[PDB]
Amino acid sequence: THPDISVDVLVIGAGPTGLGAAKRLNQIDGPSWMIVDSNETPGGLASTDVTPEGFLYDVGGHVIFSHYKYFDDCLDEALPKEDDWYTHQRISYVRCQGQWVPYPFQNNISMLPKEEQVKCIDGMIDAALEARVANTKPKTFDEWIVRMMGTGIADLFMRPYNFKVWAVPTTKMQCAWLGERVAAPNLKAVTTNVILGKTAGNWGPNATFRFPARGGTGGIWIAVANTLPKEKTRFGEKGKVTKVNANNKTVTLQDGTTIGYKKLVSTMAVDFLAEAMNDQELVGLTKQLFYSSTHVIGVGVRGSRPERIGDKCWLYFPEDNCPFYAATIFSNYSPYNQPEASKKLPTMQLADGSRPQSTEAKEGPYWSIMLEVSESSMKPVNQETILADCIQGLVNTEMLKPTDEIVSTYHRRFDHGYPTPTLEREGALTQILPKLQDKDIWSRGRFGSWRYEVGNQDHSFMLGVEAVDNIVNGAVELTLNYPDFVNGRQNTERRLVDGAQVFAKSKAQ
Amino acid sequence: THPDISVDVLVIGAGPTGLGAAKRLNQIDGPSWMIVDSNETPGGLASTDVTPEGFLYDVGGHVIFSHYKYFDDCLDEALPKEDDWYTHQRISYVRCQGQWVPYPFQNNISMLPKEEQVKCIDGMIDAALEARVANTKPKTFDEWIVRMMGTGIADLFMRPYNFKVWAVPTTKMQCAWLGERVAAPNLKAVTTNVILGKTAGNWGPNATFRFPARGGTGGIWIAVANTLPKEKTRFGEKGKVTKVNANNKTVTLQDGTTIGYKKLVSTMAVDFLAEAMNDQELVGLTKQLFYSSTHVIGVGVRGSRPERIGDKCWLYFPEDNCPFYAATIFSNYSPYNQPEASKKLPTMQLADGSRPQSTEAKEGPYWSIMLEVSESSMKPVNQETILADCIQGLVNTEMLKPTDEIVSTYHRRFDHGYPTPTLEREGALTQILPKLQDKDIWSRGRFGSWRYEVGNQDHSFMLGVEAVDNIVNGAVELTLNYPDFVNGRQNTERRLVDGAQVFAKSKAQ
Amino acid sequence: THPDISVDVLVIGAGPTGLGAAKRLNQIDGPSWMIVDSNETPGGLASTDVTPEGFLYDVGGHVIFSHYKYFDDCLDEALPKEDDWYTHQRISYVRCQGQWVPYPFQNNISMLPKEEQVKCIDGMIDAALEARVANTKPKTFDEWIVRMMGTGIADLFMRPYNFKVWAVPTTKMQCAWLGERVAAPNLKAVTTNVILGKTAGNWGPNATFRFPARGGTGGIWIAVANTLPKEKTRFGEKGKVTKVNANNKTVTLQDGTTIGYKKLVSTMAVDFLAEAMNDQELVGLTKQLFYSSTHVIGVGVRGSRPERIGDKCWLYFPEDNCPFYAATIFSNYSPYNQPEASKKLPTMQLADGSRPQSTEAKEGPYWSIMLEVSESSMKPVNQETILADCIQGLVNTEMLKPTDEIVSTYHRRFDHGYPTPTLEREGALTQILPKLQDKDIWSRGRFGSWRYEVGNQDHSFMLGVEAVDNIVNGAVELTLNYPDFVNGRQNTERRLVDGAQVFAKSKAQ
Amino acid sequence: THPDISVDVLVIGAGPTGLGAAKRLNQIDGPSWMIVDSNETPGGLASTDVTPEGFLYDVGGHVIFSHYKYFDDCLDEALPKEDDWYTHQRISYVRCQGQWVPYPFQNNISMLPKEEQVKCIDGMIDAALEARVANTKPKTFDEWIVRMMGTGIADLFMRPYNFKVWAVPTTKMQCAWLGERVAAPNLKAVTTNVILGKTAGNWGPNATFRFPARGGTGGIWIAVANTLPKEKTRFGEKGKVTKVNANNKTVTLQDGTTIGYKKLVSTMAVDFLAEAMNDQELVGLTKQLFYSSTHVIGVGVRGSRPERIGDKCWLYFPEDNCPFYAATIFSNYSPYNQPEASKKLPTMQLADGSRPQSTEAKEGPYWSIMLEVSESSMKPVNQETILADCIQGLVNTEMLKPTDEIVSTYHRRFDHGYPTPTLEREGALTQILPKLQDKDIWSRGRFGSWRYEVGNQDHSFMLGVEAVDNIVNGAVELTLNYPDFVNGRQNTERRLVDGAQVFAKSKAQ
């Protein structure tokens, strides 16, 4: 038959990965193509939302660090101005027994109760002598942890937190994925630091980072999308992909529109990929993976930001006094993530969950905090409770005086929050992925790919870019198959203008 | 002034590297490009010779295990017919103590005296213990050897072999360039062998391969080149470059003709290049590294190839029982390497260097042997003595009976035969190579990029290809920059058919 | 009341230990004393028995190696003549898959099937690399074995044999006791030996050893006893100790004789000790110990000793084709352990368990073999079967041709054969022994002490000696509390004549 | 011809050792003997001396730990009175850059400058790892030291100090003398104690030594000496032994007396013994030995035990500002180690060594510092300076304010202070001792038998007892050839009254 229309290449989804695709597609501009999204608003998970009260919230505190000069090119193109951006220094703390413990946890043991210090140092000495003897390799993530850290830190922080974040015990996932993320401590220097009750806060992927002036992180993907030809895109219920026939290389939509493709690029969750294909084998295979749902909770609050807080960017919570694994001061990122002091809002409620004295709308400055709470079969959540539970956690954490006035409340639940790096993961993937490609499909994304090592924004955008560049110029996908490689380097070669483009506009003479 | 000719990208040299340039270049066909070469006949050092007596001798008799599907693509495009190729499993030997020992060396140690067996093993056991206890690595190749090998093993085989082949010790070499080239010995495996007296030859990158029926290894490049647009090529006095004006982007010839270039790809020897553009910073740099000059000697011999010779291909010579560092049975490769069975040739003279009984021209069939030996300031050779001593060595090594009739002989020598991986090499190259791109020069190859880790035909051709792909599409050269990457993988993505090509075709409608 | 008689010191039992006691007691001569034994014939387990056919058998092949110059003194005194003794070289073999494998097993792997050789060498390489990493210590005997030897030899020989001997799995006993007994292999030299198919038979406690001219090893203790005052001794049913009251320091006998003592020395089995004391606590404690019963089997056989046998002294049987753990050629030791060739005996039966072809008494020379079979709750035995089962095992071991004529048969069962070095042993002893001493009692012996490390004849005799010397001169008991000490040395200080004795006879002037 | 008298045993020298040997000679009371010394006084070099002002000083901080219940027996007997006993908890410090640091110095590193802290700590880390791996053995004292400490603590105590006290580079001394303990730096302890800045030292509740109420350790000597019948002693210029003929077993006395002996115990310096016996070989051999020459200097001071002094016992000095390796406050051991408060004495000099402005003789109370200065040809000393040195450096360490008043001075240089544990010491000893012993000579002593491992008063004493009881009771000399053994145990077995003796006494009935 005749597909309603046909291109050489079809990109499904408007998130960062889909947009990497669209960006290189558009840049080379050799082949027929176009991109679709169920969302009239592009950016997917990387997008932003807002409360009627006027407070903005990302999906869980998205911050920028990139290994890609291409990614950076695209960004600077979409937000070219100096003031389109704010530049911040990473500030991280961990809440343990009343303390704010500077990240990395390790050398900051100095700030601990001396007894817990003792425990940590002990377990760590054990791990050190033991490691001295190793040819071999860690099996589980847990095992890895215990190996690089020691049972003191393991029991104290690592385990409880990492379950709080992953919604599964650290024993049940693997250690393959940790290369530039998770910190492995050096005993000698830790001893030293503790001796001196001093800190080293310089390490981490985040030394400096930047944030969009206004519009939250969703503004990046809006601005980025704006750069494309519009008739080459469809977002809305017209963008919703209902069905896939990989044998006809055709896709059916919500409106029953049909589309042909020579090749396909899909950023949508691979399980839904399969479900939409009606491929029994494939779905059976995709069920083998695991993921965690995220609940995002922001809070509007009245009054100029407290002194107890200040320059703190985001931070973590191992203890069980709070439902959330992490939290973020959004106000610190820019002035535009919350309304203006000048504007008058009424107090929604007291931090202790009580009526304010009255109903009047007053102004003051304000501030914003965004915390995230995980859910899975091993760690469920109750929706109604969970919000109040969070606010409570804030109380308990010495975050808010119960006297504090809550001006705003935000809650939303995301079904696929995280690819879960379980042990079964590589077994399932190494099956799924190549299976797809032989059908001429590139599944890439936080979910399309399902590799969390690679699940950051630049990572995704570059998964799209690479998938494309492979489909055209036969480029290998390093972001995909060689994460430690891509992460362990600055990638300078690929730019938004390539010698091809240069020599074409050269040819124009 | 304007120059006589101008290209987007200028390619110098017919070396497989350069031809990789011209091939990818032509394929994409985006910018203007050409190739210019001194030699009238393509392939350069990959090109083949024949004695006045009708025997073919390559330069070394190069054989193939290929890491490049694109490569095999151009090869199967140049040789689309069935009979075009012959295929063989590898037979490799090592000459010590009146005994032929197969590769890999150590397992087959069972063919040695139980005494030499003993000592070797002991070196290997000590080495094994130390091996379990080191966390660290070798500065030098020698330390490398002794480390994963042991002494008896080393002295018997490794150190001497590498002297004969490099014209240098094992101590003056850096240890970083291998792990493809040589096996990882399991003292266990070696033992189980020695225990049983069992024979298995499995190891090496030489595993199985193809050889051109006719033309030797040079016909390949003849063909592959004849697939290029002719106006895009110059080989002869019309092709020789007398000078390079580096910042004028201009190139000057032996007939006087001139070329400006947007990009410059040199496969030409990096030192040669240095003096050529006449810059003493660069020439000082280049001269910071020296090389081993190589001697190639082929020889034709009368009658059915002997009882002893049989299925063997190439052989290693650690012992001082001769001059030559290694040899090849060239006739083994193809039936067409030697003159026809029916052709009559007289015996030029006996393997014992005396005169023959019959100055008569008779036939038998003929077999051909071809061996190579290096030379340098620290391992000199005599130009007049060499040949004689080679044939002598043939007799000794039990290649020959002095009764044997020499039908033909070949000798020729190349000044730059091998890049030598000095401990000083990268420290220098990290200066030499980078600067060229500041001038827009990709100097790639064996002697172009000076890395034998990627030294071989398919590799060099690849340095060219990738230099192209980087110059157009901004790919990174993992061949040049990252050897173990490309080597430890099969690279399936890059090819003679890519999306660009395909959709040029499709859209043509 | 009045004990029938009273001495200062009472020794119970005439075995080697008891005799050590009596010997030093007598030597010093200071205190009142005497010694009693249930046995009209002294020597206990160290004694000898004889078949009506005239073949004598020890209790399981007792051979002499001593660390004690005092022991040696006593011996030379009792058997002062040159010809009272024979001097032999230790010859030991192990039956594995048809081979006679020279002791020590390890380096004699050369004589093994090359495949089993492989296995052994492998397990051993493992154990070696693993041991290279150890600070730590072996827990069980099994663990010890596997550590020093490797899983090849472990599975092959050590495990099955050691259960065959101990009547308990190696896992269930401790590695504390092995210092000069059990051999721990050196990989390097083992490899070497195997490469050369050669042997090293020089190690062991036994390099040379001696045997009593006539009378078996019982003759030693007969002579040794003869050396004492007779009225100072009681052996018979007049020597049998029925009861002990440690509170009265009095002992009652079979005849109801009663005896007082200031101190007591007891070589009798400590469990029977406690049972005889009627001490509930004690017995409860002594039940915590384990031991193995021994069945001793000798064989009279007709005809001059076979060539297959020769100089072989004794040897071991890991395999399950035979009931017995060990066997000895008694004929080799002395000509007097079997009757004289000149004497005519009838054939009792065929080696295949049949009737001879006549009942007539014929002479020939003869020969003797003494094998031992263990018993315990984990390895029981059937009395009647077990003999014929043994003869059978001989047939199967290529010991006797079924055609061989059996002249003589010996069988006897010993309830306490061995102290079993179970893991529980030290826990039990450290409770039992000091408990005893506070009652002024020294329990010493193979069974009085229950320490097998110390369970050899010289060990025993010296346990008696030391216990005494302690009870008088405040000597420490090194044989007892410091076995590794006594064993790792030649003990030259203590003699049969001491300075005291010399200076007393000096005082006689 | 004839000796003026004949003994079985001749003991040369009245010091601790001679006294031990004698003590058992009588203990046993089997044979005849005589004991001699050239001094009217028993006690040799373990003694005490008294000043004109009535101060007194032991010979170097003689302290109580006995591994021997026998040694104790002798004591308790000698000095019956509890009111003759003074009991002191063990107290110890070291002077480090102004600091008093509780033994062990390791665990108290906490009191130190932080730079030096981490220094020591990296030292111990590196050490604890390399040691983690060690298959090998330390060939020097120093070697083993660093293997214990890590270079940090290594530098900061034992190198400069142990050279201070040993007067030889510790790299020139064996570590073997410290016997069987593995040099396994204990990191967890140091680390933790360092975290806590927690001070932890010497030992208490328990660590203690008793001291004679009056008359010092010479006082002890006379105390237990008097317990002998007088006739068997020769003491004075009279007892002095001027010649040794081991052939006739005659010792020629000073007065012209000569004495025959069956066996000989001689505690005078091994060398000097070789001189007296005029043995050339043994002279040339004793030439091989080494040892240090010692200076003892005590000080009278005015006033009551000071602030910085406290109840502290004795302390060490690694630094170069003071000549002594150690000093003990005698004041605390017995109130009688100094004149009575009411005694009236003049003041010699001022702590800084100025004139007492008043030369009147007044009372006040007093206290006492003894200290010790090392000498070798490696570390020569100056008699003149030395007193004033220990003075100054005493102020350099702030043991005095320059005003502190000195009531008296004691100085003496003891020729043979210490035998040194050089590597060569066993090369000498092991040869020399068998030589002598076979002459029927037991040469035991500080410099008689030469081993610091067992150098204590109790070690000497019991080495003599050991020897004698060898000759008579057939006893091995454990404190002799097994200092690891004797030093590692509770030796309860030999008492001053032995069962033998108790039985002899019962037969006195």
What is the spatial distance between Cα D333 and Cα B277, in angstroms, rounded to a whole number? Answer: 91
Residue D270 CB burial class (10 angstroms; 0-12, 13-18, ≥19): buried
User: Hey, is the C-beta of A381 within 8 angstroms of any chain D C-beta?
Assistant: no
Chain C positions touching B133 (Cβ under 8 A) are 132
User: Hey, is the C-beta of B129 within 8 angstroms of any chain C C-beta?
Assistant: yes
What is the spatial distance between Cα B62 and Cα B10, in angstroms, rounded to a whole number? Answer: 28
Bridge-based pairing state of the strands A290-302 and A405-420:
antiparallel
Whether A351 contacts A394, CB under 8 Å: yes
Q: Could you give the 3-state DSSP secondary structure of residue C63?
A: coil
What is the spatial distance between Cα C383 and Cα C284, in angstroms, rounded to a whole number? Answer: 30
Q: Closest to B474 (Cβ–Cβ): which among A30, A472, A494? A: A494
Chain C positions touching B132 (Cβ under 8 A) are 129, 132-133
Q: Could you give the 3-state DSSP secondary structure of residue B159?
A: helix
Print burial letters for D320-339: b (CB count within 10 Å at least 16), e (below 16): eebbbbbbbbbbbbbebbbb
Q: Using alpha carbons, select from B161, B166, B130 the residue that is nearest to residue B146.
A: B130
Which residue blocks in D232-319 are alpha helix, DSSP H? 270-276, 280-286
What is the spatial distance between Cα C15 and Cα A413, in angstroms, rounded to a whole number? Answer: 87
Whether D54 contacts D367, CB under 8 Å: no
Rounded alpha-carbon distances, angstroms, from residue D15 to A21, C319, D265: 97, 66, 12
Output the six-digit token pair for C5: 């008689």
First to last CA, chain C: 43
Query: Please, what sign has the CA dihedral across residues B466, B469, B472, B473?
Result: negative
Output the six-digit token pair for A6: 């046909």
Print burial letters for B93-106: b (CB count within 10 Å at least 16), e (below 16): bbbbeeebbbbbbb
Which residue blocks in C278-322 are alpha helix, DSSP H? 280-286
User: Hey, is the C-beta of A195 within 8 angstroms of any chain D C-beta?
Assistant: yes
What is the spatial distance between Cα C271 and Cα C140, in angstroms, rounded to a whole number? Answer: 25
User: Hey, is the C-beta of D196 within 8 angstroms of any chain A C-beta?
Assistant: yes
Looking at CA atoms only, how far is residue D127 from chain A in angstroms?
12
DSSP at A399? S
First to last CA, chain B: 44
Mutate to test the interface with A, among B491, B493, B505, B507 (most CBs of A within 10 A): B493
Examine residue D104 and say whether the peptide bond preceding it is cis (omega within 30 degrees of 0): yes
Whether B200 contacts B190, CB under 8 Å: no
**Phi/psi-derived region of residue B271, left when phi > 0, alpha when psi is between -120 and 50, beta in every other case:** alpha
What is the spatial distance between Cα A336 and Cα A219, in angstroms, rounded to a whole number? Answer: 12
Mutate to test the interface with C, among B117, B124, B195 (most CBs of C within 10 A): B195
Residue C52 CB burial class (10 angstroms; 0-12, 13-18, ≥19): exposed
Q: Which residue of D has its CA nearest to C25?
A: D500
Q: Which residue of C has its CA nearest to B120?
A: C192
Q: Using alpha carbons, select from D329, D103, D75, D377 the residue that is nearest to residue D227.
A: D75
Q: Are A504 and B30 a contacting pair at CB < 8 A? A: yes
Bridge-based pairing state of the strands B250-253 and A290-302:
unpaired
Q: Closest to A475 (Cβ–Cβ): which among B8, B475, B504? A: B475
Helix axes D457-473, C499-507, angle to 10 degrees: 60
Q: Are B121 and C191 a contacting pair at CB < 8 A? A: yes
What is the spatial distance between Cα A466 and Cα B462, in angstroms, rounded to a whole number? Answer: 21
Farthest-apart Cα atoms in chain B, separation? 78
- Edge-first strand order for the sheet with A290-302 is A99-102, A92-96, A314-316, A326-329, A366-375, A290-302, A405-420, A349-350
Whether D315 contacts D94, CB under 8 Å: yes
Q: Which residue of C has its CA nearest to B123?
A: C188
Q: Using alpha carbons, select from C417, C446, C429, C314 the residue that is nearest to residue C371.
A: C314
CA angle A457, A461, A467 (to 5 degrees): 140
Cα atoms in the 13 Å half-sphere on the side-chain side of B284: 4
Q: Which residue of D has its CA nearest to A112?
A: D195
CB proximity list for B484: less than 8 A, separation 6 or greater: B179, B180
DSSP at C415? E
What is the spatial distance between Cα B126 and Cα D135, in angstroms, rounded to a whole number? Answer: 13
Q: Closest to D503 (Cβ–Cβ): which among C472, C475, C500? A: C472
Q: Using alpha carbons, select from A201, A193, A202 the residue that is nearest to residue A112.
A: A193
Looking at CA atoms only, how far is residue D283 from chain C in angstroms?
28
**Residue at token pair 């220098």:** B428
Strands (E), D107-188: none
Strands (E), C351-404: 361-362, 366-375
What is the spatial distance between Cα A501 and Cα B229, in angstroms, rounded to a whole number? Answer: 24
Q: Which residue of B has its CA nearest to C187?
A: B125
First to last CA, chain D: 44
Q: Using alpha carbons, select from D488, D371, D318, D420 the residue that is nearest to residue D60.
A: D371
Whether A274 contacts A286, CB under 8 Å: yes
What is the spatial distance between Cα D178 and Cα D86, in angstroms, rounded to a whole number? Answer: 30
Q: Are B121 and C196 a contacting pair at CB < 8 A? A: no
What is the spatial distance between Cα B405 and Cα B365, in angstroms, rounded to a whole number? Answer: 12
Residue D229 CB burial class (10 angstroms; 0-12, 13-18, ≥19): exposed
Domains in chain C, please, with CATH? 8-509 (3.50.50.60)
**Residue at token pair 């009472």:** C10
Q: Could you give the 3-state DSSP secondary structure of residue A40?
A: coil
Chain A positions touching D187 (Cβ under 8 A) are 125
User: Hey, is the C-beta of B389 within 8 angstroms of any chain A C-beta?
Assistant: no
Rg (CA), chain A: 24
Looking at CA atoms only, how far is residue A398 from chain D in angstroms?
29
Bridge-based pairing state of the strands D48-50 and C85-89:
unpaired
If contacts are CB pairs under 8 Å, which of residues 135-194 in chain A contact chain B?
135
Chain C positions touching D184 (Cβ under 8 A) are 135
Q: Could you give the 3-state DSSP secondary structure of residue C30?
A: coil
CA angle D120, D122, D125 (to 5 degrees): 110
Residue B184 CB burial class (10 angstroms; 0-12, 13-18, ≥19): exposed
**Entry field: residues in chain A:** 509
Q: Using alpha carbons, select from C451, C436, C458 the residue that is nearest to residue C483.
A: C451
**Technique behind this structure?**
X-ray
Output the six-digit token pair for D433: 């001792």
Q: Closest to A493 (Cβ–Cβ): which among B31, B263, B474? A: B474
Bridge-based pairing state of the strands C290-302 and C33-37:
unpaired
Output the six-digit token pair for B307: 């009882």
Query: For every residue of D301-352, which 3-state class applies, written as one string?
Result: EECCCCCCCCCCCEEECCCCCCCCCEEEEHHHCCHHHCCCCCCCECCCEECC
Cα atoms in the 13 Å half-sphere on the side-chain side of C419: 28
Q: Closest to C132 (Cβ–Cβ): which among B114, B132, B192? A: B132
**Phi/psi-derived region of residue C365, left when phi > 0, alpha when psi is between -120 and 50, beta in every other case:** beta
Strands (E), D104-224: 208-212
Which uninterrupted H or E stretch holds B406?
Answer: strand B405-409
Residue D237 CB burial class (10 angstroms; 0-12, 13-18, ≥19): exposed
Q: Using alpha carbons, select from A50, A45, A56 the residue that is nearest to residue A16.
A: A45
Whether C100 contacts C94, CB under 8 Å: yes
Q: Using alpha carbons, select from D204, D186, D202, D200 the residue that is nearest to residue D110.
A: D200
What is the spatial distance between Cα B490 and Cα D112, in angstroms, rounded to a whole number? Answer: 60
C-alpha A505 chain-centroid distance: 38
**Phi/psi-derived region of residue A194, left when phi > 0, alpha when psi is between -120 and 50, beta in every other case:** alpha
First to last CA, chain A: 43
One DSSP character per residue, B281-345 reads HHHHHHHTS-EEEEEEEEEEEESSPPTTTTT--EEE--STT-S-SEEEEHHHH-GGGS--TTS-E
Helix axes C159-166, C141-148, angle to 10 degrees: 150
**Residue at token pair 């004493």:** D461
Rounded alpha-carbon distances, angstroms, from residue A111 to A192, A328, D489: 13, 22, 45
What is the spatial distance between Cα B190 and Cα B240, in angstroms, rounded to a whole number? Answer: 53
DSSP at A74? H
Whether A372 contacts A325, CB under 8 Å: yes
Q: Using alpha carbons, select from B426, B441, B428 the residue that is nearest to residue B481.
A: B426
Whether D27 contacts D20, CB under 8 Å: no
Examine residue B104 and say whether the peptide bond preceding it is cis (omega within 30 degrees of 0): yes
- The amino acid that residue A83 corresponds to is D
Looking at CA atoms only, how far is residue B187 from chain C in angstroms?
9
What is the spatial distance between Cα C227 and Cα C22, in angstroms, rounded to a whole number? Answer: 10
**Residue at token pair 């005029």:** D278
- Edge-first strand order for the sheet with D405-419 is D99-100, D92-96, D314-316, D326-329, D366-375, D291-302, D405-419, D349-350
- The amino acid that residue C184 corresponds to is A
Examine residue A42 and say whether the peptide bond preceding it is cis (omega within 30 degrees of 0): no
* Resolution given for this structure, in angstroms: 3.1
Whether A210 contacts A87, CB under 8 Å: yes
What is the spatial distance between Cα C411 and Cα B301, in angstroms, rounded to a whole number? Answer: 82
Bridge-based pairing state of the strands A314-316 and A92-96:
parallel
Write down which chains contact chain D via at least 3 CB pairs under 8 A. Answer: A, C
Kindly tell me the number of DSSP H helices and DSSP E strands found in chain C.
18, 23
Mutate to test the interface with A, among B186, B442, B471, B476 (most CBs of A within 10 A): B476
If contacts are CB pairs under 8 Å, which of residues 245-264 in chain D contact chain C?
262-263
- The amino acid that residue D340 corresponds to is E
